[PDB]
Short mmCIF file of C-alpha atoms in Angstrom, two decimals:
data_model
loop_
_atom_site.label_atom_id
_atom_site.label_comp_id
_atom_site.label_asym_id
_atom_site.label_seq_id
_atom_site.Cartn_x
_atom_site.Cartn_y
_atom_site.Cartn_z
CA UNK B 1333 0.00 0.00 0.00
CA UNK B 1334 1.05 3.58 0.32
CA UNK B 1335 1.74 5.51 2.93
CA UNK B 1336 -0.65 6.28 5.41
CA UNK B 1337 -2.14 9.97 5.25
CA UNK B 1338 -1.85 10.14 9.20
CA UNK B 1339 1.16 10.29 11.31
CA UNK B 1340 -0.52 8.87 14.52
CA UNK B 1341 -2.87 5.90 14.17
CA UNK B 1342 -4.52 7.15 17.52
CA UNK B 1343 -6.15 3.36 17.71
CA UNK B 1344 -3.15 1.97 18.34
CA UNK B 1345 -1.50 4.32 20.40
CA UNK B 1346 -4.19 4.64 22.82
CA UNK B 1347 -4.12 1.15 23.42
CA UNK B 1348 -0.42 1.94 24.96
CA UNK B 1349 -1.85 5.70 26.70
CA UNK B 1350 -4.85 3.48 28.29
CA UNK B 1351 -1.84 1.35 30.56
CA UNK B 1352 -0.73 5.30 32.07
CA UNK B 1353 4.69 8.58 32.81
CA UNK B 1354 4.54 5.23 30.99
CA UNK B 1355 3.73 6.25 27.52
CA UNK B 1356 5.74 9.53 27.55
CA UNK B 1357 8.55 7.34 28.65
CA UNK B 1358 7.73 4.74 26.05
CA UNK B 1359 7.89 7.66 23.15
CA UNK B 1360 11.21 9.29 24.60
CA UNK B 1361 12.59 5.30 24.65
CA UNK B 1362 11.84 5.02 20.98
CA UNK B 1363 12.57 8.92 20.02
CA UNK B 1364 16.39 7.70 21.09
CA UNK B 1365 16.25 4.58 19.46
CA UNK B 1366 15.15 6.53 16.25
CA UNK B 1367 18.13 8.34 16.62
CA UNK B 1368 20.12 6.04 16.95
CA UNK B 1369 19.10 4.08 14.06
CA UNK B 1370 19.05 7.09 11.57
CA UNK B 1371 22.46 7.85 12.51
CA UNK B 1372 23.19 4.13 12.32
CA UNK B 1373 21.83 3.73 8.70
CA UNK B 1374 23.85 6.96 7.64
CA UNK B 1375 27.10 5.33 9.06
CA UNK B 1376 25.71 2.66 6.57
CA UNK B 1377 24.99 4.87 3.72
CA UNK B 1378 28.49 6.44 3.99
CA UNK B 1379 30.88 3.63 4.80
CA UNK B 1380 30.52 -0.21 4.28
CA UNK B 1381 26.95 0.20 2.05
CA UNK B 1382 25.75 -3.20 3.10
CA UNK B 1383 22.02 -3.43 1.89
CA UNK B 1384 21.45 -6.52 4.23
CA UNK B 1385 22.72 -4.03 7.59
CA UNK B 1386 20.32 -1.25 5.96
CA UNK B 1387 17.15 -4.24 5.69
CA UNK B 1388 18.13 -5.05 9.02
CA UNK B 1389 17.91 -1.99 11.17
CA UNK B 1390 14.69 -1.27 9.07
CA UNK B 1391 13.31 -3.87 10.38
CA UNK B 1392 14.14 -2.57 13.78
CA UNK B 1393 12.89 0.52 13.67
CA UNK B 1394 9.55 -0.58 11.88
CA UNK B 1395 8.87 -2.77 14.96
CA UNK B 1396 8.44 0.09 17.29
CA UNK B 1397 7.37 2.59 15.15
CA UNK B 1398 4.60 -0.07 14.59
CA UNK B 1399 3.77 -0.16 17.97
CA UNK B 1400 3.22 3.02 18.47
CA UNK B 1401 0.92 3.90 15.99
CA UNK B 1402 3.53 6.41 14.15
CA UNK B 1403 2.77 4.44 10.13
CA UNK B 1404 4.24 6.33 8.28
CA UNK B 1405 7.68 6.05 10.07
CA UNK B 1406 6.92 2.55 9.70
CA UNK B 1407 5.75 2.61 6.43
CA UNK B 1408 9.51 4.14 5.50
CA UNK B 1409 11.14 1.88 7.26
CA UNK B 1410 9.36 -1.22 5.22
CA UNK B 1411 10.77 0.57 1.82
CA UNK B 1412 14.04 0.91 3.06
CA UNK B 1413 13.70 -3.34 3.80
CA UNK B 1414 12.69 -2.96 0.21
CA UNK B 1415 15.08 -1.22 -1.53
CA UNK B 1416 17.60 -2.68 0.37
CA UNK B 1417 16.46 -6.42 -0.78
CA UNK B 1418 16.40 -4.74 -4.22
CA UNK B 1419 13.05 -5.35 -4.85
CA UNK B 1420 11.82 -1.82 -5.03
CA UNK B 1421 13.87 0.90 -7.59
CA UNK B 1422 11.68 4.13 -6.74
CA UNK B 1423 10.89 6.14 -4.02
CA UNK B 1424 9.10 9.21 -4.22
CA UNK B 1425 9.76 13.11 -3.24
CA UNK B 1426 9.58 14.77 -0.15
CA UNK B 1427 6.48 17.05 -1.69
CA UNK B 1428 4.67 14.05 -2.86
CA UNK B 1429 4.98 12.43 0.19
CA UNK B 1430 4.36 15.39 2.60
CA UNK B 1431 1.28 15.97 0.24
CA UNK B 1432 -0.53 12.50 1.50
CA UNK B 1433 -0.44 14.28 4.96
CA UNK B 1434 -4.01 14.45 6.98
CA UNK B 1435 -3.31 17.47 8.16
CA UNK B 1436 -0.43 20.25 5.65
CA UNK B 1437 -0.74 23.19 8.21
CA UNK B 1438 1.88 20.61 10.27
CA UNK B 1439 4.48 21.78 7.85
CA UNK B 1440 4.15 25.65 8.33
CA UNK B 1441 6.89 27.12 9.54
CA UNK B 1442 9.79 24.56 9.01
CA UNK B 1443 12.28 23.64 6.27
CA UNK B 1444 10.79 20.21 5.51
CA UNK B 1445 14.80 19.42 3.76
CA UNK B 1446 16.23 20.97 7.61
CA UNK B 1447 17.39 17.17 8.80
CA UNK B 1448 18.68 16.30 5.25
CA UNK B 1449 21.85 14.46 4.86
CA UNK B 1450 23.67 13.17 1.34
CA UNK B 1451 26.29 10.86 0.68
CA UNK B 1452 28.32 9.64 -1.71
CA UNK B 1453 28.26 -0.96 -9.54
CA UNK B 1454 24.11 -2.22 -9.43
CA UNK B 1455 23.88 -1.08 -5.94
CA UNK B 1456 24.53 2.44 -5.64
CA UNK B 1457 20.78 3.05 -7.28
CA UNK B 1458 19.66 1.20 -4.17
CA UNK B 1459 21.91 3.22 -2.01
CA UNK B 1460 21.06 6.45 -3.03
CA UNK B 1461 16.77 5.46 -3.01
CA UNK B 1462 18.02 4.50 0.81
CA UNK B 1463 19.57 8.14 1.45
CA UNK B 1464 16.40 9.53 -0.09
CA UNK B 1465 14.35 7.20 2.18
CA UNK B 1466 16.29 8.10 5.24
CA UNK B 1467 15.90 11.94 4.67
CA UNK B 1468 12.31 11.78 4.10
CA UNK B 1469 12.41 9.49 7.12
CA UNK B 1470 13.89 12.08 9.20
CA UNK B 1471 11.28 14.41 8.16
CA UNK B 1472 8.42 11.67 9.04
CA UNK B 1473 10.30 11.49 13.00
CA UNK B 1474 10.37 15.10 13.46
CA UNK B 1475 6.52 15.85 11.93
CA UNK B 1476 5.24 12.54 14.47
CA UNK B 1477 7.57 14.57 17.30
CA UNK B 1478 5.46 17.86 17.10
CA UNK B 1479 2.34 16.22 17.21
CA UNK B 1480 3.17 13.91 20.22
CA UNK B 1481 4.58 16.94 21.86
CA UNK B 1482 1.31 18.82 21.27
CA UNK B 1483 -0.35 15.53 22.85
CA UNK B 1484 1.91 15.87 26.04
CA UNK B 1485 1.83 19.11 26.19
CA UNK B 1486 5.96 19.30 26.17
CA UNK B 1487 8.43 19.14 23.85
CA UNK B 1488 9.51 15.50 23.38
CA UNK X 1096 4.28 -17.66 41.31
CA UNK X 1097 4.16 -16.82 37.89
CA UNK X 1098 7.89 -16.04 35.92
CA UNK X 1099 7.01 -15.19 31.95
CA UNK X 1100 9.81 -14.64 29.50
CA UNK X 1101 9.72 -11.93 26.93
CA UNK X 1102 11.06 -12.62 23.43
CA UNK X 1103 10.94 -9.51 21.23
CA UNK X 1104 13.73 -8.21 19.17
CA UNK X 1105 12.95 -4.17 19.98
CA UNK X 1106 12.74 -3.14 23.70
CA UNK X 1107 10.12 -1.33 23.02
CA UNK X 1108 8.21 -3.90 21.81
CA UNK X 1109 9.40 -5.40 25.21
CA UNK X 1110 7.75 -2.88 27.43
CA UNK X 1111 4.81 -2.34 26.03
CA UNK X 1112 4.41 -6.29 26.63
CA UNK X 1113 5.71 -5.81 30.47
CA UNK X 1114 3.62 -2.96 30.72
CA UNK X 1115 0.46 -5.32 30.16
CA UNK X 1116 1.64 -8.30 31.77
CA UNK X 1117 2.45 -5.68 35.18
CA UNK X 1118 -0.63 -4.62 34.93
CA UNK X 1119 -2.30 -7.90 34.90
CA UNK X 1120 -0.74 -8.63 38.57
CA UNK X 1121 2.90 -10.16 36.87
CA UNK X 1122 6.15 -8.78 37.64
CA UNK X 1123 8.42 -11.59 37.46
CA UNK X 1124 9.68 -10.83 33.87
CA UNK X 1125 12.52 -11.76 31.94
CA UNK X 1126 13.50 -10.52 28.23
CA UNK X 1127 15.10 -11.92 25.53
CA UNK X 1128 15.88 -9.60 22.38
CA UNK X 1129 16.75 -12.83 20.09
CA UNK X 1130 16.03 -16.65 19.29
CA UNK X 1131 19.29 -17.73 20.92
CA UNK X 1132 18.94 -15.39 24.14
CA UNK X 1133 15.69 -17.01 24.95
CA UNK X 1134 16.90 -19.94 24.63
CA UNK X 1135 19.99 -19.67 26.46
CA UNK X 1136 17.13 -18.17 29.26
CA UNK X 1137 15.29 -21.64 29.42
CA UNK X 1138 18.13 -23.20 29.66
CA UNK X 1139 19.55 -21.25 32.11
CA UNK X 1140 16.19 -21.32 34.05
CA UNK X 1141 16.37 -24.93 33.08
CA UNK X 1142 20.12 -25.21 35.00
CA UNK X 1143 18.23 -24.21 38.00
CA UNK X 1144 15.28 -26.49 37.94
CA UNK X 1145 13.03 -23.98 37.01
CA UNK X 1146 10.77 -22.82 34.62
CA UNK X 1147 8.67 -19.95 32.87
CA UNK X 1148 5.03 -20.59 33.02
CA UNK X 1149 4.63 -18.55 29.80
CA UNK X 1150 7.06 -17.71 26.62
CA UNK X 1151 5.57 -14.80 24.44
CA UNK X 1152 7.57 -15.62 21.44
CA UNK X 1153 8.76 -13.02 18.36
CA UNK X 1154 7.90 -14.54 14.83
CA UNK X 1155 10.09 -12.39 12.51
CA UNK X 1156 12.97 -11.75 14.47
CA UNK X 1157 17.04 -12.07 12.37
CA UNK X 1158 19.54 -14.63 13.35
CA UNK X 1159 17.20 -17.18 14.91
CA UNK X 1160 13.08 -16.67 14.22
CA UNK X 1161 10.84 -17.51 16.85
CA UNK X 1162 9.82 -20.87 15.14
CA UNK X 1163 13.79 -22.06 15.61
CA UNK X 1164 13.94 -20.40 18.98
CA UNK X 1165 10.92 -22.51 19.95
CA UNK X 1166 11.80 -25.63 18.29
CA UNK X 1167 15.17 -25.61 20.23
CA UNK X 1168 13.62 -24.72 23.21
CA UNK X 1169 11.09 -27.93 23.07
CA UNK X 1170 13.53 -30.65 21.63
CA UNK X 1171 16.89 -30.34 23.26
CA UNK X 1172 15.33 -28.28 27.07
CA UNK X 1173 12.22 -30.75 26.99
CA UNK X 1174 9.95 -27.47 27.76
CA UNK X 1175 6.36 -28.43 27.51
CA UNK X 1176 4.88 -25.03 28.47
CA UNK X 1177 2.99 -22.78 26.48
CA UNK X 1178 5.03 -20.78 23.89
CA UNK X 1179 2.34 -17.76 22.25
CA UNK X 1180 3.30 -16.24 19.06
CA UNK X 1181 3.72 -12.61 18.70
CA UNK X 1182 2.93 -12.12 15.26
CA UNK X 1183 1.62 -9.25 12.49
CA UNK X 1184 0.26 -12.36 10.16
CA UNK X 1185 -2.63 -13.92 11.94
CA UNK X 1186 -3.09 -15.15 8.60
CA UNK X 1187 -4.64 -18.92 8.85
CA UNK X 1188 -1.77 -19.86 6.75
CA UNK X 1189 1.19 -18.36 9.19
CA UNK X 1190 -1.04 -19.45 12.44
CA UNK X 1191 -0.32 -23.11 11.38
CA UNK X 1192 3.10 -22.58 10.41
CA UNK X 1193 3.70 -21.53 14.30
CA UNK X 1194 1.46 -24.71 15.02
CA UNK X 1195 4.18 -26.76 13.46
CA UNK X 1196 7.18 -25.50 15.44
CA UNK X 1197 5.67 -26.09 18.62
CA UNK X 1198 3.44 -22.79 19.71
CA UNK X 1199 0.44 -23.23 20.77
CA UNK X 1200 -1.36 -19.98 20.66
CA UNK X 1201 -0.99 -16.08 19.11
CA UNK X 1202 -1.27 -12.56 19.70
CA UNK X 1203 -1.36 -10.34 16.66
CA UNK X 1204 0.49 -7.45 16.86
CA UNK X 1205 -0.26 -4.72 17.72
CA UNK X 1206 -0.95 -6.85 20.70
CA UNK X 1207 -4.08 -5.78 22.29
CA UNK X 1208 -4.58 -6.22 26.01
CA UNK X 1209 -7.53 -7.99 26.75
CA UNK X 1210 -6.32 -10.18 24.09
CA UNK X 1211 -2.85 -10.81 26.57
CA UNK X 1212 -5.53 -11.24 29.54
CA UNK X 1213 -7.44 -13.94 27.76
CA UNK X 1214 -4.57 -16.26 26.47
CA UNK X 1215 -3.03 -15.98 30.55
CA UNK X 1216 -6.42 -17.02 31.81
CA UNK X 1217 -6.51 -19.58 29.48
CA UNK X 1218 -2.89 -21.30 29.48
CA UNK X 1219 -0.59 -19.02 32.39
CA UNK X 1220 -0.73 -22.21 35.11
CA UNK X 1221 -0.97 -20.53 38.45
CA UNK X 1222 -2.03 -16.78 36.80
CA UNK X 1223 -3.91 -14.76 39.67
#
């Protein structure tokens, strides 16, 4: 399928909120683990390009981003799997993504490219839909940030 | 009494399982994050004459699967306990597949709690 047009699938999330400190501690848990796997892929993207690390830490990530209801995180994550089993040779925009979003007035006031990152044989047209992924990935983490900080009412 | 181990390659994943099974009066909880951990855990728990009354087992999980992890677990540790999928395919056709390992029940993910309540009232031996 595509991506979902909603960042939070507030079904599944509130299945997590109805066991509350837990959940906000739960979302700053994965918010690091994000992190950490973004910069992890990069180190990927930039150094030993293994396609079967990139798969792997997709698969990571998409487990918790799952979890917690934030799809199209997930959803990324599952195309990186893809392009990084080679199975997939596309992935689309920034703009055509962002323009699936539920709700556009999100993206007022903020440089949707901010978190982008670059780098620099059949793989490197894998490679590169994987840097594109990751950026647009980046942007996905931030946009599900604001609204679960709006949610909280801090900044998380 | 009850002692459950965890087996879910994300900690996350992890505590929002915890999370339920705390809330459902269980606090003895261990976690594995792979095939091989959880099985080094029963047998482990197994070196000390003891035993979980519950495995929660990962499906799709890299190095060892939860279908290995359990197969391993029954054949060489002897474990005759209930083993319950964690899985995002409750598809008829993946539900047997776990059959055939050696689980005996599933939780689709995400796992929904009064899902987790009725598969511990069902097969958790000594569950409150």
């Amino acid at each position: 399928s595509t991506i979902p047009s909603e960042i939070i699938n507030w079904t599944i999330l509130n299945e997590i909120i109805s066991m509350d400190d837990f959940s906000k501690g739960l979302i700053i848990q994965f918010i690091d683990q994000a992190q950490t796997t973004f910069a992890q892929m990069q180190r990927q993207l930039d150094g030993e390009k293994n396609l079967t690390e990139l798969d792997n830490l997709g698969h990571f990530l998409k487990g918790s981003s799952a979890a917690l209801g934030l799809q199209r995180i997930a959803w990324v994550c599952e195309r990186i799997q893809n392009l990084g089993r080679k199975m997939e040779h596309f992935f689309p925009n920034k703009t055509e993504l962002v323009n699936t979003l539920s709700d556009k007035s999100i993206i007022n006031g903020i440089n949707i490219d901010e978190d982008d990152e670059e780098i620099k044989d059949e793989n490197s047209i894998y490679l590169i839909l994987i840097a594109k992924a990751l950026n647009q990935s980046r942007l996905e983490f931030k946009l599900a940030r604001i609204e679960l900080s709006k949610y909280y009412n801090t900044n998380l | 009494s009850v002692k459950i181990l965890v087996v879910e390659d994300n900690h996350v994943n992890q505590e929002v399982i915890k999370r339920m099974l705390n809330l459902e009066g269980i606090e003895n909880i261990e976690l594995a994050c792979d095939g091989q951990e959880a099985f080094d855990k029963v047998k482990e728990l197994t070196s000390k004459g003891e035993n979980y009354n519950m495995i929660f087992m990962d499906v799709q999980m890299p190095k060892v699967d939860g279908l290995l992890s359990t197969k391993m677990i029954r054949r060489d540790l002897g474990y005759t306990s209930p083993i319950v999928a964690l899985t995002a395919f409750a598809d008829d056709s993946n539900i047997k597949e776990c059959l055939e390992s050696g689980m005996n029940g599933f939780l689709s993910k995400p796992i929904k709690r009064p899902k987790l309540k009725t598969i511990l009232t069902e097969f958790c031996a000594a569950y409150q």
